[PDB]
Amino acid sequence: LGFPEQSLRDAIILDLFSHALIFCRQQGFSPEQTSAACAMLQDLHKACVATPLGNVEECYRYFTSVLFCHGIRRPPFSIDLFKEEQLLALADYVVNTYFRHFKLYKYVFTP
Amino acid sequence: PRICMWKYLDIHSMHRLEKAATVEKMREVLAELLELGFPEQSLRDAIILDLFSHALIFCRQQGFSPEQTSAACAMLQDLHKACVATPLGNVEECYRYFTSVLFCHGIRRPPFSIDLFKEEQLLALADYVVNTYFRHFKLYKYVFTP
Amino acid sequence: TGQLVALDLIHISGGKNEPDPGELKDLTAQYFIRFEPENVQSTAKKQLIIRNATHVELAFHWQIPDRETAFSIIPEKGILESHSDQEFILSFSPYKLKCFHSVLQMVLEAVDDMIVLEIEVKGLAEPFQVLLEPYALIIPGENYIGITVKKDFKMWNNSKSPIRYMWGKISHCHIIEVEPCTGVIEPNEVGDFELNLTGGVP
Amino acid sequence: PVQEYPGALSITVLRPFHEASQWIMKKELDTIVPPNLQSRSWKGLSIGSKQLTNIPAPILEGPKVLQMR
């Protein structure tokens, strides 16, 4: 990303990933589960900003599918990386701004 | 920093919101009260309506007294206006501004304040507040600031 | 005669590695040394074998500098001999509960024809395998005020973890004490603790 | 034996319990995954008195609630 002062979109993305790093720094995801959920947030950001039309439900289902791909043990398509308390918590994540702030990010990152 | 009770929503509008037990009807009532247009024509009004609606939903989830309802709604509206009053980055000034505004409601000394509230609920807010919006401050900044 | 360097390696289980490395250095199929439950003191001991086919008097560079703390390689120095079997001892001592991973790069500078060889090492640490017997101790009978009663209970750590530990009691009147307050178990060592109850409340 | 009462004997019973709702069920199979595909770390419908062969409950090594009497 460029400097946050020159582009507000990069500032928003950097704030999102900064609150990504600062939060998960306790209860504990290993760096593996870490990069997992981290790419989860990035990938659903890209999927939500892929079209200017509203796609809240479709992106929700996509996130939950990839969630159970990271919560269920079935190689080479899913890995038992997160725990059940953790996986319900991950479900709790993307629900609980990226589909209500979905309009904010939609206004910002849809040309 | 003043008492924001029955400032934007009175007892009648709150009772209307209370009779609306469902999310959608309550969203409709809030849109009617806030004089906001249809969410499908402007994204700013939709964002404001969603914010207030979910706010009322979780406030349902915990449970308190009505004067608290109006105080919290009016304080939310005032601090949103303060955050969007200027385009420059103004996180800490709104931070300290409403820090001062708390004491005008959390500690009993009239007429500048009144003891409507409890310490646990306060700290709950300190919590939820510094958790969300000043993290998402740029999101509302990009939308509601020139 | 002119000679090249070919990576001929053997696992602890005797599994050979493909000549002219095609499976040994494939990004998808980088050999992944994952470990079974390993504790924090007895390192994950695995043996890898490296085969030589030349008499060249040359050195080697093990890059990851050498790894400290969580990984130990034996030996760390010495120029091998022609047709000699260079065994490498891999020791993995995790420092936390989270599963650790390390990447080992064997730099070879005899010359796609041939490139540096990469090792993936991963090992998991059990959080705690400490078991108490009995997990609940009760003093049957009526103890008068100023009367103390002590009972012995046995704790074992069925793991390779001589981790130091502390014993904290939730007692508002210093009724119940335990000795020793602090102790150091040994791997798979079982320890006897004495709990003393000096209560007098009705 | 009671350290103070002569001849009296106090009897104590310990029993693990459920940390949560007793009505929360547990499936017959904890996992349905092939015993090898896991990543390693009838008699008739006799509604009569068929003995419920209580498999000796897995020894709860430090269960979180012990019921006491």
Curated annotation (Swiss-Prot), chain A:
Domain of life: Eukaryota
Intracellular or extracellular location(s): Cell projection, Cilium, Flagellum; Cytoplasmic vesicle, Secretory vesicle, Acrosome; Cytoplasm
Name under which the protein is recorded: Cilia- and flagella-associated protein 119
GN (gene name): Cfap119
Full-protein interval shown: 112 to 222 of 333
Curated annotation (Swiss-Prot), chain D:
Disruption phenotype: Deficient mice die within 12 hours of birth with severe defects in motile cilia. Mice also have skeletal malformations. Male mice are infertile because of a severe defect in spermatogenesis. Spermatids display abnormally long manchette structures and defects in the morphology of the sperm head, acrosome, and tail. Additionally, the transport of proteins along the manchette microtubules is disrupted in the elongating spermatids.
Subcellular location field: Cytoplasm; Cytoplasm, Cytoskeleton, Flagellum axoneme; Cytoplasmic vesicle, Secretory vesicle, Acrosome; Golgi apparatus
Top-level taxon in the UniProt lineage: Eukaryota
Tissue-wise expression: Highly expressed in testis, round spermatids, testicular sperm, epididymal sperm and in condensing spermatids (at protein level). Expressed in organs that contain cilia-bearing cells including brain, oviduct, lung, and uterus. Expressed in articular cartilage and bone.
Subunit structure comment from the entry: Interacts (via the C-terminus) with SPAG6; the interaction probably occurs on polymerized microtubules.
Clinical disorder: Defects in Spag17 are the cause of primary ciliary dyskinesia only (Pcdo) phenotype. Mice are generally viable to adulthood but have a significantly shortened lifespan, with chronic morbidity. Show neonatal progressive hydrocephalus, accumulation of mucus in the respiratory passages and male infertility.
Function of the molecule: Component of the central pair apparatus of ciliary axonemes. Plays a critical role in the function and structure of motile cilia. May play a role in endochondral bone formation, most likely because of a function in primary cilia of chondrocytes and osteoblasts. Essential for normal spermatogenesis and male fertility. Required for normal manchette structure, transport of proteins along the manchette microtubules and formation of the sperm head and flagellum.
Protein name: Sperm-associated antigen 17
Organism (species): Mus musculus (Mouse)
